[PDB]
Amino acid sequence: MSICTSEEWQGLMQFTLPVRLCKEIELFHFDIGPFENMWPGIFVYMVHRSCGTSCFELEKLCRFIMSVKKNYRRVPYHNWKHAVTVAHCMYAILQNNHTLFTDLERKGLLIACLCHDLDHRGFSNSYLQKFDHPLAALYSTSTMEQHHFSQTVSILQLEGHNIFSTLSSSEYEQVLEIIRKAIIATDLALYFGNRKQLEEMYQTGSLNLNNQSHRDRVIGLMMTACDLCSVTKLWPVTKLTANDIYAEFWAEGDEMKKLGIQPIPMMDRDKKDEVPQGQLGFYNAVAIPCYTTLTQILPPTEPLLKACRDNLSQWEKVIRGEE
Numbered sequence: 001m002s003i004c005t006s007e008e009w010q011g012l013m014q015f016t017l018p019v020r021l022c023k024e025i026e027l028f029h030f031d032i033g034p035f036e037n038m039w040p041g042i043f044v045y046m047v048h049r050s051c052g053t054s055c056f057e058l059e060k061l062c063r064f065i066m067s068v069k070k071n072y073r074r075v076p077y078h079n080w081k082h083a084v085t086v087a088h089c090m091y092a093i094l095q096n097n098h099t100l101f102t103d104l105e106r107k108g109l110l111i112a113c114l115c116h117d118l119d120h121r122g123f124s125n126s127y128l129q130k131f132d133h134p135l136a137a138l139y140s141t142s143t144m145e146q147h148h149f150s151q152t153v154s155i156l157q158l159e160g161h162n163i164f165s166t167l168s169s170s171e172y173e174q175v176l177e178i179i180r181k182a183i184i185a186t187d188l189a190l191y192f193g194n195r196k197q198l199e200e201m202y203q204t205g206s207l208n209l210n211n212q213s214h215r216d217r218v219i220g221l222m223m224t225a226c227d228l229c230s231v232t233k234l235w236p237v238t239k240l241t242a243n244d245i246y247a248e249f250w251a252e253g254d255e256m257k258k259l260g261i262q263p264i265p266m267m268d269r270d271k272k273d274e275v276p277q278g279q280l281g282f283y284n285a286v287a288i289p290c291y292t293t294l295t296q297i298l299p300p301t302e303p304l305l306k307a308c309r310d311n312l313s314q315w316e317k318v319i320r321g322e323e
């Protein structure tokens, strides 16, 4: 477990957020990218606004973040930057649907978004299973996603890092099930079944938000909506984030080609030309259905569907030779 330092903690505790951002952060389309030095500060602020100021002991909270950052590897996409990106969309979702959720779910989900891809190796579940990796042996399904929760807990157990010190064991075991379910749900393999049922719930008007099974499903989707939110940004930010993604995908494809095995077209850098078409398929199969059903259940999240459709037209244009 990579532990943080004190001068990192002393610099972050004396962090104001510039007043121009105070308005900007609240918006769904907000792009954190240009404020790398402000991300630990931006997450502290987001936790502060959603769960209240005096919620976590700020010594611990600040300590928890910089070790979360240290336990993200340097890889093209699934990194510290990504985690904070995913955390902001959740902040925006939670802010615009506040009383729909509870202290422990808001505190739990924001942390879980920040922790949701901890120590990602730039490898998908297919790979790790296809080559009998240690992690795939210990976790048969949702392979990385279970390791992420395993890692999330390992950080909480560290010296003065347990930000849930002031929770009763009841609350503490409640909050770890919110986090675990949320982190497992980011496994896209599960989303498809999750979204299918939530649409059938929604269409035959029987979703009840204080029905406990529906909460975990609705929260399950929210994590997918947060994980995929590069598609909900402005067009240039999306084109740039798609590169970061494919650079991780093709990295994974190179390793296959060293082992003498054809990678899937998504992970072949020698199929760059199909990128325009491949995004279109993901947008129609995954993204649009994700944010349509979310907007249906939480109407204040409509700007996610809005911007998703904007970036669908852009990929539609790129295939139609008008980039």
Ligand SMILES: COc1cc2ncnc(N3CCOCC3)c2cc1OCCNc1nc2ccccc2s1
Binding pocket: 124, 188, 227, 228, 230, 231, 242, 245, 265, 266, 267, 271, 274, 275, 277, 278, 279, 281, 282
């Ligand atoms: C915005 O994009 C993505 C975002 C993602 N965010 C999270 N998880 C993902 N995956 C889902 C897949 O298993 C690993 C995890 C994501 C996949 C994405 O790419 C869209 C798919 N691209 C394709 N490019 C090509 C190129 C040639 C032929 C076919 C295709 S399909």
Ligand SMILES: [Mg+2]
Binding pocket: 116, 117, 144, 186, 187
């Ligand atoms: Mg993941």
Ligand SMILES: [Zn+2]
Binding pocket: 082, 086, 116, 117, 186, 227
């Ligand atoms: Zn993720």
